[model samples]
Target chain A: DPFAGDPPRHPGLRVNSQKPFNAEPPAELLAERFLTPNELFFTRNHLPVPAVEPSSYRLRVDGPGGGTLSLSLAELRSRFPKHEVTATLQCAGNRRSEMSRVRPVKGLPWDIGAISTARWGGARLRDVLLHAGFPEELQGEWHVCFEGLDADPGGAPYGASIPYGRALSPAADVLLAYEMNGTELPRDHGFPVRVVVPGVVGARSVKWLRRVAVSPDESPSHWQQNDYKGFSPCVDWDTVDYRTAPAIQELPVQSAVTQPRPGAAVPPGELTVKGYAWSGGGREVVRVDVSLDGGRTWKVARLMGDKAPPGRAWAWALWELTVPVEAGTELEIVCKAVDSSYNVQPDSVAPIWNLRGVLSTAWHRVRVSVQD
Target chain B: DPFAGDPPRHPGLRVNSQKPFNAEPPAELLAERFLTPNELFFTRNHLPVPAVEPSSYRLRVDGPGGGTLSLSLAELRSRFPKHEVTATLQCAGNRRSEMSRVRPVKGLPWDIGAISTARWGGARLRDVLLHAGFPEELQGEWHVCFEGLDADPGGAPYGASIPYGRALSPAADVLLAYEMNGTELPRDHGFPVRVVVPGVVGARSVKWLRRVAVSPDESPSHWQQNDYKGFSPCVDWDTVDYRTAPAIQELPVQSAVTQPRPGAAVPPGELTVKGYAWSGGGREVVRVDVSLDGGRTWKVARLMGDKAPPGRAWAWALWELTVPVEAGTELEIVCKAVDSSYNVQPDSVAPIWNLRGVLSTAWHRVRVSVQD
Candidate 1:
């Protein structure tokens, strides 16, 4: 099986795609602890994993005015001090299936599992840029591109970039990560190194990062200009103006109920609900509200996570809510989260439904039939 | 000239509609101080003001199984203890103008100032519900409808409804407001009485409140059924299906820069950014990210507001961020707010733009050319 080379996944994890090894841990297991188990966390892969020889790996940093700097994987390990950052990586297609239910949206039919958290250790991107002779001042607007060694049958490398401002943000804790959850990177996940841009859309955290370029413009990769852009709900594939919209970077407020999967039959009395809540831009998830009778009434859930520094936290929150249930009744359980800034998930999925199905952070509702 | 018969308005406010009396204070004035001045607060009226005779004001509360209770304005005053709540009321079409920029959306071309704050004093809504003989239980899905005495050309009353659960929620703090700021309600701003559903769209706060009905179904009024509901960006007037979506109750996160109006030339070296940040559903605005270099670099703004009780706050926050500026440069000054729940605004407006232009709380960006 294609999974033979990848790390072993938890048996309880719900596999949504077998070939690419995408799966999420069982819903109830999500809130067991704050830091998700590495193998049990969800996996999202757009292409086949590339074979990498760590000793032979070379990272190239290029720019027009700035000269190129090439370093072996060993140099990346030894030249810069090791730094660890905890952040949640969520596929842009996370919870896309919810939007698909409202109206057909094209993309992966991903569920709540397309998001997970980890402790990533690597070198500070700022430190590496200082070593590569990044300009102290620029004449015009500038951007930094990250390219991955992984590619498809065609002659294109997986690539993306961020504005130089974000690349050089004083407080941005972005990393060129090598280890996840205290272990060497797995093949399915980027093996040698990947850019871990905290609070940015996971797509920008290009995996198997092999090259870096400083430029006055964004990457010309199809993903940067075409695939990752968002459109109005009315914009169909035909009317989607590529130049009209900018590519998505930081995401909006988002949360999802993970426990008691759809159509779950439960014994009446006390019903325990569990879920995960997160927001992009290094914001913290403050609270989660769970309603047993649809959204008629909501009760706050207990959130478990170490407190984060103000406006600097990059981790996800695991929440659990328990409520009394009526026997022999169908209960529509819904959950919406509030973040540190008090931003919340939209009430329904209909309005937020986009053609690409990205940013689907609507109130997640699950109907359950209770048994006596 | 068109301000006749209505409450005296502020000259600085920009009028969107004349006869119906809709206006928003200029962007710079929104943050003049936090409790939005009554004259400057955005006014949205669907019809001409109703002549309210305070002494004769009879509020009829009816429930199918629970019987009717009619109370005069005097009885209403002494019937329940007066409670005061500080909240921000926002029009659903508040930021419609921004969405129109992406593509033409229907409805009023309202700009950014369709939201404001006030101290509302009124009788406890839950107290009136129980006093009106509302049954404790027995219903599948229930709603509480409020009918305003204010009527249209056809004499149909302006009416709306909220979920019965919200109507009865102890934490929701819904009010039958008779006072604005510290004085009697203004004629155009819902005189005599209005149902103030905090953290919800302003349309639900029916003016000239007269009748309340508790039912097993939602209000069948046009505003409740056909309007005030969000649609997919793809759904336009030609193909919009109102039946597919639910009327908006609580709104999502919202924030906007109110200083340095777009196209304004600014002196460089030091820049001060100001705005209001709020999230519906009692979520507190925790942080605002101000980017002077377009969306590249962000600095956290200092929030000005008393900390709110968990999920009980109804007020918006005033935020200020000052950063060094580059002279002779056009700056894309963008601000995206995060709430206590960590929910942040979308980076672009195109993806969230709907035909109705409701919920357009994307990052507020203003391009300003700086002067030396």
Candidate 2:
């Protein structure tokens, strides 16, 4: 019943999760637009999209003092100054296969499509926090919890918690986004309003968001407490202890070319390479470098994106570089991205590889030929 | 029952056909000796290893203008002039993986280890053909058919054939090998004498001292006529017609580095790279080049092997080269082999990819850090 009235199926959709309607656009279509079309943007949903009537929708906020306040969607949007951010959201499972080759790891064999960039526009979450009775007196070890209306079979709703400072920090681009790519949110994209926690795993960016709670402890949801944690490569299903590691939030710097796929031949002249780059937790992508001969030499890529609202750069910035190649010889093209914090992808996959095949951020290389 | 005996298992064994007791040594071990150790040489079996006693073994030759002439294993060994050939045996599936990546092709996911070089000592198949009563006057488009003693539950025995000219040509080096790596044939390796169709697929090198039939048409064995064929990348499970392609015989030139496994770091200093090179159809390996800087510069490797035979050189030659890396910078080591005909391994896995995940012989490249 939760999957009711899903969007009409597209022939080109490469289905990842069919029940929640998650799909990625074909690889070839990726280069056509710098801002991924909202429909073409990859969707990651832990639960079915909830249908809400904007006129009567209400967001309930529970404060640490046991005070509860309810605000209609209309009132929240009109009261807060609208902000927009263009940031990339990546699943923890992105590029999982690179890790699989390092060691016999487990999980879905995802290539590089598990991440995408998008433009999100909505009211600032900081403004909403103040209006919802966030206590100024709370000083030490406080956390802000978010709860989505979507629930699992056991009726346990999807929830996560950000650090109290991260929620109120002027630098954290946390948003109650109501629009994507300059358009009203689609039914499947959490219509009305949903919190956008940039730089965190998509699982923590809950959709169909309905509740917020400020507390001394982190969210009690399974996703926040047990799942999304990184584990050692030695740990497997038979020897796993979820509590051994803390939950994953910020992502590493990552980039990959989506055109002229590995082993494809380049035309006899100049060839241009294009790809996307983004860092977790509001850290802007600083620079991307493309290497034509493995990593022997690199050329800085040209990044493209207009400045967005302060503390809310959620969408991806597309980068491109063109270089001439000699005829009759094979060429290996590699790409690596660096974030504002100077975090760069690893050169090889073996070191960072874990048993769960999660968070594989390695330099992506492809080989192609220049025809005579 | 073929696996009845508990042979000392080597940790390096990559089990392919477990029931047939077939496996190949790890790639790094292939160059440990010029003549691959008998137990370590790649074994390709279409059926369970037959339990054959050397004293009771009889090889029957039956064909046009001839009656079935049965010779004991000792008689067959003494009657014909015994010869030795250092040849590499490759399975039709040797590099099937490179083909799989081109499309969703089907077959075993064999790595490059499916082929191995070994010294084969035996009588020539041509000598046996002439002694079998085939008149010199009989000349037509005929093939030499071979049948293995091992049979399926349906009564169909493993069989294959080769063109009569190729079988009889002195250049073919087709031998009825009775010894491998200087040791009398092990039961799993066709104890008495097995046809060694050098330069051809192991599938055509029928095992067991069985029956040989020279006929005007190709052998109707499931392997020869139905399998062991190559096709275009566009062919898939639903659109495949095996008959449209010619059966695979001699493999393409291939070379791979066994040492310095991918991601193996080298201490700061000069580094020596080592690997093996081999070509099919007796084509000699001419040169092997090593690239320590990801192909920017190449160093010719020192080849260590006997000169190419009069016509075909079936054995692989081990090659080594030393190069220096910058003190602080990491290096990507790559090696590729060129045969007498100058065939090189493709640079990328995508074009050669097939559904079966076989034949993954791309340029062997590994990234290693140099500790200064």
Candidate 3:
């Protein structure tokens, strides 16, 4: 069976689909706490989970100079030092489902939960690259490829790549992860080992890790060169050139209120609003402004916990605020976040609504009714 | 006497000038902690301090329409609700001293100490304007003028203005402040009440605020019409036109290293770096990226605290990090911060370097020698 190796999952997750295993935790649970529980974390799989044995698994590192270095699962642990990073991994389509209502598109109808934060433990990709005889200094524009063990019916493995500069940057925090939340990796997630490219899009973080290639160009796989690249919103089904735009690397700034779930009625005296805010390329979230009276009045939400480290903040920021309100009222709440570089969310969604419905981060506004 | 009302100042402050009372704290003291002390905060006065008794003070409100509202000092406090905002106030010429090296300019040779954060208590401009009978909804583009009691030797009052939309926007948090740093405003700062324009350039926040005017045109003050506006590097004193440019409103993303003073020597084992990052218009400073090897290798700094309410965070955030260093060598430590909007400091100063040498937000670099 194609689903024979699928791992068991938590039942509390609200399911959007079953065959490919798509689900999201209820909105309120998503941002009420800082670190999301592993069981409640959302999962996105392109094909049936591949079963890789720890004993036989080997990560092959290909060279820009036509050389190869093979590292076994046990060898990676014994030969390299381990590092842990708290980071958020988000699918490009996490909020795209909301955009589908704007127009029509195909793919998993992922809700906001298609993103989560975890304590990822692994070996730094930089260390492993140097161990494989790669030069210390990356001389020119180069490509770093990652290939997955998971394959389609015709048996082609999933593949993707990022710029060598990003892969080698000390602060970039790319890893060959073997554990999530201090436990063995779930089967649905890459089992033996997987690439964790923090601050980049989920597609570039290849799961079911098996191979790495250093070259002068990006991966030629369909996902890398064709499907994952973005296009103009004006370009529709009849006119999209996937080759026109470069593949997604870093995601834009994004945030959404998760507590006091939208459309859910609440007793209105002092309403506490909570949510998560994040930016790609390790940019930290500087502030989250919440407006209880639409955009007419705004209050600053407190960024929960310690401020994240500058560029290594591949993690997300949890925020909350309490504002007074009248009972039996129709309230519209809006939120927008600014990052370290002073980049803020766009006010509206219509302009960024693409044909693929990817990267739908705009101002997240929710309409709520106060209870009598 | 113009100097009659000058308030008591901290003796430790490094005085830049005495007649108009210009001064700045030592660079190390600026970001030693999150909030600067009220007495230690930097001061910039363009004229001799003006004296006025609180008992006889009246704030006049003029209208583009034929209407006027005069408010007594007591009425302003008793009639409106009190609100607090934590914001960073930075002079338009904060870092102008650095620009002087590139080209000569006319102004105080302000160092990095021209910025500071404080908790301001006040009534909202929106509420004050509405109570004074101004229309609730601001239609079309409008100007709101602010005038201070302080004036030049010829008796021209200090003045400035902002967009009416900003005055009415909930997120703007413009205030008629009565307190600074949890205490009554200092006389030199603005006693009793002053216009606290959070998130914008400090010039718009007229101190010793005595009058407000809602009009179709901006205040006709030299500071508003010409002095604070930015110009291209190519423009000089002769080519500069006061009427050509709009007055500066919001400050761009800004940051500077505050510890281990620039061009200083140190014992190098583990080098600790500390600084402040801020942006105007409630835009939070996201990440402060630091580099010990000049600009080649960088690390993300940890933000100081769980602070500063989201958009109301008019205050600057403290950032810190410690990196291992080699002894007996020369090193150049550099820092640049990004705001929530992804705005970054420019790499070079020459291109942005102007004739007036203002808006000098280039990457802050500090050179030091390791003790042998």
- The global C-alpha lDDT for each of the candidates, from Candidate 1 onward, is 0.79, 0.71, 0.78
Q: Give per-residue lDDT, candidate 3, residue B369.
A: 86
TM-score of chain B of 3: 0.96
Report how closely model 2 matches the true complex, as a DockQ value: 0.01
Q: How well is candidate 3 docked (DockQ)?
A: 0.02
User: Candidate 3 versus the native: TM-score?
Assistant: 0.54
Worst 10 residues of 2 chain B by lDDT: B350-359
Indicate the residue-level lDDT of A77 in model 3: 86
**Candidate 2 - CAPRI tier?**
incorrect
Model 1, C-alpha of A292: deviation from truth (Å): 36
- The superposed Cα distance between candidate 2 and the true structure at residue B233, in angstroms, equals 39
Query: For each candidate, what TM-score against the reference?
Result: 0.56, 0.49, 0.54
Docking class of 1: incorrect
lDDT by residue for model 3 (B1-372), tens: 567567778888878888789998888788876777898788888887767788899988875466888888888888999988777789888888888887777888988999887888988988888877778566556789888998887878999998887787666788999889999888878877788888888888788888899887888888888788765545678877766444667667788988878777888788888888887656566567787777755667887756554345588889999888787888888787766434456555654555667788877788988886
List interface RMSDs for the candidates, in order.
Answer: 13.3, 22.4, 15.0
lDDT of predicted model 3: 0.78
The residue-by-residue lDDT of candidate 1 on A1-372, one tens digit each, is 533555556688777777666677676676566777777777777666778888889999875565788988889889999989999888888889989988898887887878878899998888888788775445556778988876766868899997776676545788888989999887767888999888878899888888998877899998998977655455678877778555667666678887888899999889888888888776676557777877765656888888776456688888887778888999898877655443456566654556898878877889989997
